[PDB]
Design a protein around this ligand. Structure first.
Ligand SMILES: N=C(N)NC(=O)c1nc(-c2cc3ccccc3o2)c(N2CCCCCC2)nc1N
Length: 245
């Protein structure tokens, strides 16, 4: 997250931290995700497509820091890793960039909700907020495009939904953005998602309820003028989600 503010998991209790085990033993951060039911985390396919073996991954819920344990956190193995069959990537865009992780503990349990661990509601079909609506994004991604390190503390920021009509402008993304994507950005371009925020939540208030509107997917750079964050449009994938859970 470029700009924004540091936060703790209580603020975004559905946020899932996804890591990969390396051949050799080291464990590195991969991507964010969102808990949509006790046994299911939703994320982005591009996070896993290189290393698509479920045994390689560790998922934490209730975790506020990248490389230290948070009191009350829970750790899971990935029982199922479900990537979208119609995934495709070009130079920039990732199409159908959505993935489901079924989580199970060593002792065979799913998430136990708590102050730090809660599910997020999915939107109703083809129902998104109007453009200009402020939404929140959360993650452990880079604080500056040029940084080598990820932040140790979770962050969040606010971005505003941009219309399909504005996003498709040539100086924005042209035809790279589809109707199954959403664009969001800061009016000054000063705050944004970045590398390591992929798979995390874009959350909007929809009919007086915090709702998973988008999943962090791609962008050209981070916090660059005329280059919004692009998000998988969750309200266009409900049959896929319902079917695969
Ligand atoms: N909100 C956005 N505008 N953009 C995004 O969400 C986004 N950006 C980048 C991004 C591009 C970039 C270029 C130079 C330096 C750092 C960079 O990070 C990104 N990476 C991070 C680069 C490593 C491989 C993974 C792709 N993923 C995103 N999902």
């Amino acid at each position: 997250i470029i700009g924004g503010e540091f936060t703790t998991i209580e603020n975004q209790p559905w946020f899932a931290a996804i890591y990969r085990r390396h051949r050799g033993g080291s464990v590195t951060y991969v991507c964010g995700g969102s808990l949509i039911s006790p046994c299911w985390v939703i994320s982005a396919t591009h996070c896993f497509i290189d290393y698509p073996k479920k045994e390689d991954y560790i998922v934490y819920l209730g975790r506020s820091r990248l490389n230290s344990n948070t009191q009350g956190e829970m750790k899971f193995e990935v029982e199922n890793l479900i990537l979208h069959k119609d995934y495709s990537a070009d130079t920039l865009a990732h199409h159908n960039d959505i993935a489901l992780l079924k989580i199970r503990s060593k002792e065979g349990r799913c998430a136990q909700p708590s102050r730090t661990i809660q599910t997020i509601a999915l939107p109703s079909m083809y129902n998104d907020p109007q453009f200009g609506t402020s939404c929140e994004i959360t993650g452990f991604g880079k604080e500056q495009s040029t940084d080598y390190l990820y932040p140790e503390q979770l962050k969040m920021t606010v971005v505003k939904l941009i219309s399909h009509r504005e996003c498709q402008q040539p100086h924005y993304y042209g035809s790279e953005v589809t109707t199954k994507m959403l664009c969001a950005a800061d009016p000054q371009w000063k705050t944004d998602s970045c590398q390591g925020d992929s798979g995390g939540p874009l959350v909007c208030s929809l009919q007086g309820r915090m709702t998973l509107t988008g999943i962090v997917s791609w962008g050209r750079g981070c916090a660059l003028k005329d280059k919004p964050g692009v998000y998988t449009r969750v309200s266009h994938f409900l049959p896929w989600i319902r079917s695969h859970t």
